Design a protein around this ligand. Structure first.
Ligand code: ADP
Ligand code: ADP
Ligand code: ADP
Ligand code: MG
Ligand code: MG
Ligand code: MG
Lengths: 370, 370, 370
């Protein structure tokens, strides 16, 4: 009778059971299909690969992400992803496990309705629920009041909560996250002569970004430092043994979070978005929001991002405001951890969307229960 | 109901039954016709000789190869060859044996279509199939990943397969193989005063090449070694008792595979062709191609060719790539062995081109079934 | 005091003086070196040939292209090319002529820096400038708004400009162009029995492609038409008098621009790349980009390419968008014509990189002036 927690991000699936501290399985949410011709008979050559097996065979596949900026764009591939999650990774039967799902705020309603319908009809779950990922990150923190910035592969969002009450008019959503940083790193890696163009070579660039990239405390000083000397240059070995070297692409890629105009966007950086979200809240709750800046997600995992956020929000806010950025070492899984905490609570047990409620009230049950 | 496997190379016919480990018969694919005048009545003096009987009587015949660089140029002589194979060597009736045939990649389509037509009309086979020889060579080695370098009398070709998927854009074909090496050995044997000019004397030079020639690990060092001393000189006894001696023609002949400019070709050597074929494949599959270099065919049978290929590809590839050359002792028949393995599989039984498909869909069935 | 305009493409050099309507000289950017042995004394047998003289003597040379996908890979041969351009074709002294050079977008920075250094040190130009070829193509058409699809021997690129402002985040670059089409035509010409393998025979195949190839309005219909009848077959006479015939290779070769998977690439066709470039631009500027599709370069010179681009972009775009493809009859020289127009303007005269700026600011002047 244990509940399931599935955190469907744009880039990774974090799935497990409620009551744990880490997910069962964490695998990329990709579906790969062969793009060359098979010449050997049989071999169990399947027509599509999901998750880690698609990354294993990615040299002969075309990798597709069913989720795009927090929105599911391919629903057959997403059913493939969910079937993989339930049967090959969790190795469970979804007929007896309530499933907690997550979603970004300010998302299309059809996304939520269709997840509800697929859970209740394709996978026959007894109950389900869709929770906002930033509220779950606050549950993982253990703090009732915080402003949460969640940055994932697809979306960056700010949700300010005070005493357990959210201020939905102050919620920010920015469609700039890890995948845009990967694409920008590809583009600026072309400057040194490195050409990554295929979907399989997007994973190599994502690995380069996760290993070698960091957030500069002061961008212009680091640009001058990289110009003067090669102290910031690091090498990376490609899957075929070729070695690439990057000097200032290491901090130019994550700078797009603070200067979105690098990729041609008109928006403000994550620091200015956070400050604007705080300033749309009530004046009496702003001090507690300044002191509680919870960062979650994999795009907040850069070395130096918390210090840079500290510096920028301190510059924006008054001098008597006491700015703290809470960046737990496990913030790459804060949404899943908070979802496990929430699904394990006794008070939450009356808040599931039951199967009978779905049957006798339609998929639109999800907008008024969640 | 057993299937036939006929490997028609430019130089030799390898024919047998599926399920065996070696072909029934291996004979030269030559048709000899007398060039002098008959003076004795009768004797069963036939107008043409095929296979081993043409080599037996080659002193009074003009030997012709119906296949030239993997392409059948004389179709009447090729029907003679196939009739010999079926009736005098296999001693079977082709009306009840499906026949698996082999062909080099990047070959004229008319070649394949006309083999299909002759099999289905002249020999009345119940079914047939044309397979690429490098895929068959990969079947024999028992693996589904690797780049195959197949060298025969007529063509040398590279086909990279990964997980059973071929990359047809990375397939190389080089029209330099054993027959070009035989001709070059004739030409450079003229340097010591030995004149072989006739088609029958081409077989003597081919025998010299198969017995005395080897691949030098370092060409310039071996050239210096042969210049300094006579330690590399070996003798060969001609059919009439004359003894010839060759010192550096032993490794100068096979060096044409690595330096095609010896015979006036502009192409790259087999090592550089293999490296170029690997580098036209996806970056994620290159490590497994480096570690799996399958060599098949009779022109890869030189002493020291695998070590030289190891050395050259190691020089071309990065230092962290782990280069292996797989050169089985039976690689002179890898194509036939793999064809037997393929024709014996149960999954392949639905992939034959049946007689009815040919009748009601034309000879062009072979491009979309094979 | 007239300025020079040198359009260095991967395949051809277009050089001339600013203010003209056509370049002085258009010759292949190849350097040929003899591959056989000289037996006649003297003759002025030079060790290397550049341009038209290499194509004249290509039967005894190995032709090398110093530019490869818009990137200069051999710099000594490129200095040979530039010296030829300046002294044997333009017959000028570069010490008193500012030189305008062109480059593809998303190119290595070392390419631009080394062209700047060689111009300012080897050829002693008073000033120089490197311009993006698509902006120059937009100069030639006399408009300041439109998305340019420039296809050359080495690179195909999309650059959307609106009101004179470029959107660098929407710039596409595809490393598929005329040379890849020539190689594909060689590969599929092997199907009818025609074997072109040498670098000199690459020019014959390029001539065949330029004379006999066209873009099919509907590929499958043309494939059916070529299968049914021989109405699409045309003959071509080789330099030695042999006549070759091609039926569907005529439109199968240029189809690789719309189906890059023909040569094993994962990218999208030029139509889908153009649509994707338009859709990464602001919603308010998309109507003017749809109506202004400037095509330039020699690979856009196929019969029927503009109509096919019209059809495909119309299929992709909404029905109320008004799609025009602007394909001037002189679009093979749009980059050079636009460069001449730009170098002749009075406003541009303050935008040269002067010699003193180079001397006292390094070769890195080119990234912040251009
Ligand atoms: N150590 C790291 N440094 C920088 N970026 C990272 C790191 N680890 C993961 N990422 C990025 O975070 C993204 C995945 O974060 P995640 O929270 O799983 O997103 P989602 O919730 O959308 O799945 C990926 O795009 C990856 O590039
Ligand atoms: N031991 C050997 N050493 C060198 N060359 C050999 C040897 N044995 C055979 N060959 C060459 O290999 C060629 C035959 O190889 P094979 O694989 O039968 O070619 P094909 O498939 O074209 O018939 C002949 O030209 C012969 O000269
Ligand atoms: N009439 C034509 N039809 C098709 N292709 C052509 C034609 N004329 C030239 N080309 C191709 O265009 C390329 C040269 O175009 P160009 O604009 O000069 O390129 P670059 O700017 O790279 O020199 C050559 O590869 C040639 O094959
Ligand atoms: Mg997330
Ligand atoms: Mg063979
Ligand atoms: Mg050009």
């Amino acid at each position: 009778t244990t509940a399931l927690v599935c955190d469907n991000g744009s880039g990774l699936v974090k799935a497990g059971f409620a009551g744990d501290d880490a997910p069962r399985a964490v695998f990329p949410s990709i579906v790969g299909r062969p793009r060359h011709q098979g010449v050997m008979v049989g071999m169990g050559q399947k027509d599509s690969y999901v998750g880690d097996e698609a990354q294993s065979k990615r040299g002969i596949l075309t990798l597709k992400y069913p989720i795009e900026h927090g929105i599911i764009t391919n629903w057959d591939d997403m059913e493939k992803i969910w079937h993989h999650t339930f049967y090959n990774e969790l190795r469970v039967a979804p007929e007896e496990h309530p499933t907690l799902l997550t979603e970004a705020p300010l998302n299309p309603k059809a996304n939520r309705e269709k997840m509800t319908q697929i859970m209740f009809e394709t996978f026959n779950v007894p109950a389900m629920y869709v929770a906002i990922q930033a509220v779950l990150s606050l549950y993982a923190s253990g703090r009732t009041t915080g402003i949460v910035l969640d940055s994932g592969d697809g979306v960056t969002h700010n949700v300010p909560i005070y005493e357990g009450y959210a201020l939905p008019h102050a919620i920010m959503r920015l469609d700039l996250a890890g995948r845009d940083l990967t694409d920008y790193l590809m583009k600026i890696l072309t400057e040194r002569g490195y050409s990554f163009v295929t979907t399989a070579e997007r994973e190599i660039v994502r690995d380069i970004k996760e290993k070698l990239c960091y957030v500069a405390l002061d961008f212009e000083n680091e640009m001058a430092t990289a110009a003067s000397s090669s102290s910031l240059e690091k090498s990376y070995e490609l899957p075929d043994g070729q070695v690439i070297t990057i000097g200032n692409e290491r901090f130019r890629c994550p700078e797009t979070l603070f200067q979105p105009s690098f990729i041609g966007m008109e928006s403000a950086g994550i620091h200015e978005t956070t400050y604007n979200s705080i300033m749309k809240c009530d004046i009496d709750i702003r001090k507690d929001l300044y002191a509680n800046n919870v960062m979650s997600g994999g795009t907040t995992m850069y070395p130096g991002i918390a210090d840079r956020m500290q510096k920028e929000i301190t510059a924006l806010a008054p001098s008597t405001m006491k700015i703290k950025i809470i960046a737990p070492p496990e913030r790459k899984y804060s949404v899943w951890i908070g979802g496990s905490i929430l699904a394990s609570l006794s008070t939450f047990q009356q808040m599931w969307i039951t199967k009978q409620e779905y049957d006798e009230a339609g998929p639109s049950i999800v907008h008024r229960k969640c």
